[PDB]
Amino acid sequence: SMMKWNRERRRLQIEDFEARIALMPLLQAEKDRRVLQMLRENLEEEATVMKDVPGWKVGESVFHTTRWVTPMMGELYGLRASEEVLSATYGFIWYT
Amino acid sequence: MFMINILMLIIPILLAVAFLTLVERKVLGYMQLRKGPNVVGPYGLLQPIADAIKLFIKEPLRPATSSASMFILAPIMALGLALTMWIPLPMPYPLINMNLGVLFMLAMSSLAVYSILWSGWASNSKYALIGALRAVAQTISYEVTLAIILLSVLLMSGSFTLSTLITTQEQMWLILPAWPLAMMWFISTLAETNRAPFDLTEGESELVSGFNVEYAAGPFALFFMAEYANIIMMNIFTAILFLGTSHNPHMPELYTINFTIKSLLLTMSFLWIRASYPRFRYDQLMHLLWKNFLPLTLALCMWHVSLPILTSGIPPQT
Amino acid sequence: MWFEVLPGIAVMGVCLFIPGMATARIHRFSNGGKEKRVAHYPYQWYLMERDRRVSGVNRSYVSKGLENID
Amino acid sequence: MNLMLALLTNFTLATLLVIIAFWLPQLNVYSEKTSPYECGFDPMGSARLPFSMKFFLVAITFLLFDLEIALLLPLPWASQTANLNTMLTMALFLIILLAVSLAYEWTQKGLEWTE
Amino acid sequence: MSMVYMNIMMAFTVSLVGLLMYRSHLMSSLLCLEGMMLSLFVMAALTILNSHFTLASMMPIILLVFAACEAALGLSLLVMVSNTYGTDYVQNLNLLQC
Amino acid sequence: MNPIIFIIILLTIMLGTIIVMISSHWLLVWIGFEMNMLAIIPIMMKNHNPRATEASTKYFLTQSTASMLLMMAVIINLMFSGQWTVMKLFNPMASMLMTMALAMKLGMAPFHFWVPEVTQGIPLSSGLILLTWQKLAPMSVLYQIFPSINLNLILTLSVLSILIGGWGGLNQTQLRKIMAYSSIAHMGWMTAVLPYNPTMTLLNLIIYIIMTSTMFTMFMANSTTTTLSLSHTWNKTPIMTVLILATLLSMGGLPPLSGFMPKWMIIQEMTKNNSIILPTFMAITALLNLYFYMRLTYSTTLTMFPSTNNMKMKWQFPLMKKMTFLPTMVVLSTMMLPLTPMLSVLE
Amino acid sequence: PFFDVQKRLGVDLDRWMTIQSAEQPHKIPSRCHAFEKEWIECAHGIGSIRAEKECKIEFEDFRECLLRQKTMKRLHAIRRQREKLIKEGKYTPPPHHS
Amino acid sequence: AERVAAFLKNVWAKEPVLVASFAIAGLAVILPTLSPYTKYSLMINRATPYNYPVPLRDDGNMPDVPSHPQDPQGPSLEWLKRL
Amino acid sequence: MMLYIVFILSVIFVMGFVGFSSKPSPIYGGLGLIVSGGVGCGIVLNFGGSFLGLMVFLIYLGGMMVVFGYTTAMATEQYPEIWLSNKAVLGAFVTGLLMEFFMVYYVLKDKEVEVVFEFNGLGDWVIYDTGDSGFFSEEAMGIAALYSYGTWLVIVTGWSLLIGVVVIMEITRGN
């Protein structure tokens, strides 16, 4: 009984993972827009905040390479409220 | 709304513990041709309240030459862990839904041994320390079989989520393909809870004083409540683990009624067993573990690692 | 007689029934009549957080169907 | 947050019951009242409980079996791999090696209490 | 680095100094020895989990397994010392080089 | 113990050292040290006496403290490099932690106090493993991380080891404590040449192991552990006294004996690097080693100490001890100088 | 490896957990996979002496991804000036930063 | 054999727990090497999609790779539905 | 204020270490090490390691540390035992706490402190990964690889544990 029921559960899991693969292109596409939008929302505020400091280059990278480097949590939410940062940092870990 | 849920889980646990003492005294009484409490309130329904008030208005003695800090910590540690082992249980929805719930219940039950060790250590009583070392030796020894047996069953379930055991047993109870593990799990819970015939701690006739000997009044009550909250929790675990209940998302209360009746029957089996058999010697319940169960449990652990593979019946991961 | 133990068993049974009834009814109360979403893996969290931002309100149990599409 | 709140409410209730279990009752303590129970007779000797070797071995034996259990816990997740032959060989290696340890203690009189 | 790494590395240094300054109890020195493993376990997991070094997630377990085994060895010697002099005091271990 | 268990434990000592050598992962190197420490305690606690238990607690406490320091180096290396490969360390702090951890395992000054006392409490057979075999695993790691070791740290530990080893041995009458301080002194030479030519580290290690193994075996043959106990050997096995003289002279570095080969080669490599003061100091200071080696020769070979009457009964029984490889080793430790250019095999 | 038995016998004992960029289960990448892939390729076969000089740029980026030292200093600079103009009131948070 | 009919019956009368332990342990090691269904265990594990099936760039000479998921080319899980 | 849970746990982690590192009587050294072991599980959980965090509670606390207290109770006896331990522990605690206070003070004020290494006071959350959409736990998937990738580790790790049983019986047999 367990053998047949477990094999059915594997067929169900494949069905649930197929649904994920059907949506990953859409979720991936809108993640990139969200991430790039938040970086430009920090580049603009960087220009206004850092304008009298001498030698500052707004949007200067910290890497020698020009390759795209995935930002860390700090770069994205550098200028944002605590509530929207806690969920983006400890939202999953603390969810029951 | 969550803080209300915690109270809806904590208060009824203590009440169930309160009336489990009445049920034990009456079930054993009838198995002994007696009646049991039937004077304090109709059918003894007020006996638990009389005992609770009695204990907490009684003198809380602690010997002067005894570590106060560890003397007080043990009842706190014992009762705090007893209630903590209830938050991940699905009934059918758990208060706190953990991805590793089965593994969280092993960890919490492995800290409860400290309450026994601290109880007899902070008493400066030679007899009390003897009980603690024996009680600790018994407790940790039978944890080995709990962990290995539990791992063996989870090789048919797929994960450590307590709610996935409900999905595993949707077609059939796990007791049918795992009755050898159910037999050894049930007795391992009797010895883990220090119940008969594994209760030499309470067996003063054995010339041994229990670690809960130098405790009176309320602090004795806290040790008692934790012990009886573990009996119910272990039997709740023994039901969710080997006697699965079908979960209908639209009528959750149907699950809870059946799941509660199974919990009571397994919890009333402890009273039944306590009334029928003599005690083990301390060395006989160590051989029962190190020479009978563990050789068999390791054999069955191997079988349940390869049985899902040779039958092509490996459970999912998610 | 033996049926004088049932009154004590009944009280114990009712006490053990409340924890599962309270949790089941409370979750539906706090989640718009549905089960509380379960998220054991980051993919489920991403969708749950997506539903919180695809709701106008800052709640994940408010589901917007085709009526919200263009 | 929910878990950190559940643990706090569990131990606060336990702590509250102890403080009201110590400060509510009427107390009157004298020298014989606050002595260890013993068994009704005066204590024999002024030394603590002597050490027992058999109790140390069982505790150590539990630890070494407990550690090997720490390696067997991830079996449910390991049986999801494509290399089942290697996983099955390694899982049965640990359990057998865990059984060989049990046999060694058994035959060398490690499990006996008949000092 | 990060604020957390300061305290974890600060916790290792505290236990190393504790392990190098014996008071009288050999048991107390072993506790500081097992405090050093705990900080190593936390530091190892922090680096591994943060960097998503997937195959290194088993190293902290291996570190924990062997350290516990050497903890068992340490207690065995501590026990045998007690049976000789009746106490785990370290000032009784001065027969050699004296 | 049971003979089969004794074999199992010995293979675990060897297995641990081999794992440290064939490994490419810092975790496996740490595991080999832990496995090595596990299997060595039972052979030290085999006679079951108070002194042996003390020699094990002191050995356990030092090595365990060294394993943790060696572990903190590995993790600090992981944080700054992100890999576990056994090569140079990518952070100065890890280098200092690992160098000292390996200095504690080897027993180099000022982390040297445990070597004399541990070797005195444990039987002769275990002392041979303690002073010869246990040196291999730490030397393998130093051989691989040497282009990350602070040059002043390793050289400072080398000079102090020669001084402490030479000075400490002058005031000894116990054979197990003379070999302990001698071991400290030779560790200085091996580490002093490590930054310049690591091949000479292996050469001095090989010759040291051969010479030390010859000494312990000849002490075990007559079951001698004190200077006076060894001074009776002329009246039981006179040949064994000549071999001790030949080996003790070699360990002193006196030509034409083999023990001069490593001292000779190290002085060459250090001189090539325009280092003249340090080799001269090391060479001159090594005369302290020769002095307390010479005293044993006076009391063993070159003079006849007072015997005892009961010795008249030992002449009737032969030597039944194994004395394994002793004919071979005592020839490698005394008659190999002409084969000096064979050291290139170690490259 | 002191004794390169693994290379002689063509056996992989512990080389699989040496670096982050190797084959991980389920093809899970690490945070700094790309940077390590550039530093290992730059320094391959040129010995460590040339690597410390002729691959310094690659190892600078890879170190930055591991510890984020230069990224946090810049963010610290942003949060200093930004907080400076909160009492010397000239800057106000935008609606999407609240 | 008598040592087979006397050793087996003697232990079965004095150590029944151990006899069952070695029987169950023995079957764990042996049956997987003989069971016909062990090969289906690997294929189900290898047919469960955890990662995204990253597409290939069609160079024009890959007739074995489907262009659309519903095309009749590529792996088929028909063996699993029957199973 | 809750966004600094890891740093707050790390402070309690250090203070617990100053508890048993000052070496009070072995009874309260274990209590200090138990408390810091639990907080150590708190830090690991908040970085996404649940199996590793739980393994601390199950093995380090319910295992190794239970044996320490078990042995301490019977293999050790208490002589004038108290935190008031001949002024060596009292002055060890203040030095440890005072050292921690200044370090925390200069990291929460200057947001940076240079002691051996360079430390940053922005917050432990600033280094976390942005996120993924994965249907599995990476830490769990990396430990289940022990039986697929780490055959060598299992062989030596299993052998060491087996020998540890053999070694301990020899040491403690006494003859």
Q: Which domains does chain I have, with CATH numbers?
A: 4-169 (1.20.120.1200)
Query: Which residue intervals of I22-119 are DSSP H helices?
Result: 26-46, 50-55, 65-75, 88-109
First-last CA distance in chain E: 48
Q: Residue B189 and residue B234: Cα distance in Å, rounded?
A: 7
Q: Give the range of the structural domain holding residue C35, as residue numbers without chain letter.
A: 1-70
What are the Cα distances from residue I70, in Å, to A51, B212, D68, E38, I63?
A: 65, 17, 20, 20, 11
Residues I168, D60 contacting (CB under 8 angstroms): yes
Question: Residue D56 falls within a domain, yes or no?
Answer: yes
Amino acid code (one letter) for C54: V
- Phi-psi domain of D84 (left: phi exceeds 0; alpha: psi -120 through 50; beta: other): alpha
Q: What is the CATH number of domain E3-85?
A: 1.10.287.3510
The structure's method of determination equals: cryo-EM
Sorted by sequence, the CB contacts under 8 Å of residue B54 that are 6+ apart come out as none
Q: Residue D28 and residue A36: Cα distance in Å, rounded?
A: 74
Which residue numbers of C have CB closer than 8 Å to A's CBs?
39, 42-43, 45-47, 49-50
Instruction: Tell whether A92 is within 8 A of chain D (Cβ).
Output: no
Residues D29, B103 contacting (CB under 8 angstroms): no
Residues B118, B219 contacting (CB under 8 angstroms): no
Q: Residue G91 and residue B289: Cα distance in Å, rounded?
A: 71
Q: Residue E15 and residue E3: Cα distance in Å, rounded?
A: 19
Residues F291, F168 contacting (CB under 8 angstroms): no
Residues D62, E72 contacting (CB under 8 angstroms): no
Centroid of chain to Cα G9:
33
3-state DSSP call for residue I113? strand
Dihedral over Cα of B18, B22, B28, B31: its sign: negative
Question: Residue D95 falls within a domain, yes or no?
Answer: yes
Amino acid code (one letter) for D12: T
Number of independent structural domains in chain D: 1
Backbone angles phi, psi at B42, to 5 degrees: -65, 125
The residues with which I114 forms a beta bridge, in sequence order, are I118
Residues D98, D65 contacting (CB under 8 angstroms): yes
* Angle CA F196–F199–F200, to nearest 5: 75
Q: Residue B132 and residue B120: Cα distance in Å, rounded?
A: 5
On the 0-12 / 13-18 / 19+ scale of CB atoms within 10 A, G97 is: middle
Query: I61, B103: Cβ pair inside 8 Å?
Result: no
Q: Residue E79 and residue E89: Cα distance in Å, rounded?
A: 11
* Min distance E80 CA to chain D CA atoms (Å): 10
Q: Residue B178 and residue B314: Cα distance in Å, rounded?
A: 16
On the 0-12 / 13-18 / 19+ scale of CB atoms within 10 A, E95 is: middle
Half-sphere exposure of B263 (CA within 13 A, CB side): 31
* Angle CA B218–B220–B224, to nearest 5: 115
- Token look-up 């029921």 returns A5
Residues in chain A: 96
Size of interface G-I (CB pairs under 8 A): 38
Residues B253, C24 contacting (CB under 8 angstroms): yes
Instruction: Tell whether D3 is within 8 A of chain A (Cβ).
Output: yes
Query: D60, E72: Cβ pair inside 8 Å?
Result: yes
Q: Which of F133, B97, F207, E64 is nearest to D73 (CA)?
A: E64
* Min distance E23 CA to chain I CA atoms (Å): 7
Q: Residue B10 and residue B226: Cα distance in Å, rounded?
A: 12
- Token look-up 């058994």 returns D106
Q: Which of C6, F54, I80 is nearest to E78 (CA)?
A: F54
Largest CA distance in chain F: 70
- Phi-psi domain of I39 (left: phi exceeds 0; alpha: psi -120 through 50; beta: other): alpha
3-state DSSP call for residue I112? strand
Q: Residue G35 and residue F22: Cα distance in Å, rounded?
A: 28
Backbone angles phi, psi at A65, to 5 degrees: -75, 145
| The two structure tokens encoding residue D52 | 């027992």
Q: Residue G53 and residue G42: Cα distance in Å, rounded?
A: 11
Q: Which of F119, F252, F248, F245 is nearest to F176 (CA)?
A: F119
* Min distance F39 CA to chain I CA atoms (Å): 7
Q: Residue E20 and residue D113: Cα distance in Å, rounded?
A: 39
Query: E44, F75: Cβ pair inside 8 Å?
Result: yes
First-last CA distance in chain H: 44
| The two structure tokens encoding residue B22 | 């009445």
Please report, to the nearest 10 degrees, the dihedral formed by the alpha carbons of residues B132, E27, F36, F224 taken in order.
-110
Query: E35, I36: Cβ pair inside 8 Å?
Result: yes
Q: Residue F222 and residue F231: Cα distance in Å, rounded?
A: 11
Q: Residue C2 and residue F337: Cα distance in Å, rounded?
A: 100
Q: Residue B302 and residue D91: Cα distance in Å, rounded?
A: 8
Question: Residue D87 falls within a domain, yes or no?
Answer: yes
Residues E88, E82 contacting (CB under 8 angstroms): yes
| The two structure tokens encoding residue G56 | 């310094």
Centroid of chain to Cα C13:
23
Q: Residue F292 and residue F168: Cα distance in Å, rounded?
A: 10
Q: Residue D71 and residue D94: Cα distance in Å, rounded?
A: 8
| The two structure tokens encoding residue I102 | 């200044």
* Min distance C43 CA to chain I CA atoms (Å): 4
G68 → closest Cβ in I112, I127, I152: I127
The residues with which A72 forms a beta bridge, in sequence order, are I129
Number of independent structural domains in chain C: 1
Mutation choice for I interface testing from F13, F31, F37 by most I CBs within 10 A: F31
| The two structure tokens encoding residue D44 | 């024999």
Q: Which of B272, B120, B274 is nearest to B195 (CA)?
A: B274
| The two structure tokens encoding residue F133 | 């075999």
| The two structure tokens encoding residue I74 | 């019977």
Give kind and range of the element (H or E) at residue D18. Answer: helix D2-23
Q: Which residues of F122-149 are buried (b: 16+ CB within 10 A; e: fewer)?
A: bbbebbbbbbbbbbbbbbbbbbbbbebb
Q: Residue I27 and residue I85: Cα distance in Å, rounded?
A: 13
Give kind and range of the element (H or E) at residue H37. Answer: none
- Token look-up 């019946």 returns B313
D82 → closest Cβ in H25, H38, H45: H45
Could you tell me which chains touch chain G, where touching means 3 or more CB pairs under 8 A?
A: A, E, F, H, I
Residues B200, B282 contacting (CB under 8 angstroms): yes
- CATH number, domain of D101, equals 1.20.58.1610
Query: Which residue in chain B is spatially nearest to C40 when comparing CA positions?
Result: B99
Q: Residue B28 and residue B272: Cα distance in Å, rounded?
A: 7
- Token look-up 């309270």 returns C22
Q: Residue D88 and residue F36: Cα distance in Å, rounded?
A: 29
Dihedral over Cα of F16, F17, F19, F23: its sign: positive
Q: Residue D9 and residue A74: Cα distance in Å, rounded?
A: 34
A7 → closest Cβ in B167, B177, B313: B313
DSSP secondary structure string, I18-33? HHHHT---HHHHHHHH
Q: Which of B191, B169, B167 is nearest to B318 (CA)?
A: B167
First-last CA distance in chain A: 33
What are the Cα distances from residue B304, in Å, to A13, B58, B181, H36, I101?
A: 22, 53, 10, 18, 53
User: Strand I112-115 and strand I117-120: pairing?
Assistant: antiparallel
The residues with which F85 forms a beta bridge, in sequence order, are F25
The residues with which F226 forms a beta bridge, in sequence order, are F174
Give kind and range of the element (H or E) at residue I118. Answer: strand I117-120
Where do the structural domains in chain E lie, given as residue ranges?
3-85
The residues with which I118 forms a beta bridge, in sequence order, are I114
What are the Cα distances from residue E9, in Å, to E28, F91, G10, I17, I123?
A: 21, 15, 39, 11, 16
Question: Residue D61 falls within a domain, yes or no?
Answer: yes
The DSSP call for residue C39 is -
On the 0-12 / 13-18 / 19+ scale of CB atoms within 10 A, F56 is: buried
Residues I25, E25 contacting (CB under 8 angstroms): yes
Question: Residue D1 falls within a domain, yes or no?
Answer: no
The residues with which E25 forms a beta bridge, in sequence order, are E89
What are the Cα distances from residue F246, in Å, to B294, F223, F254, H45?
A: 60, 19, 10, 69
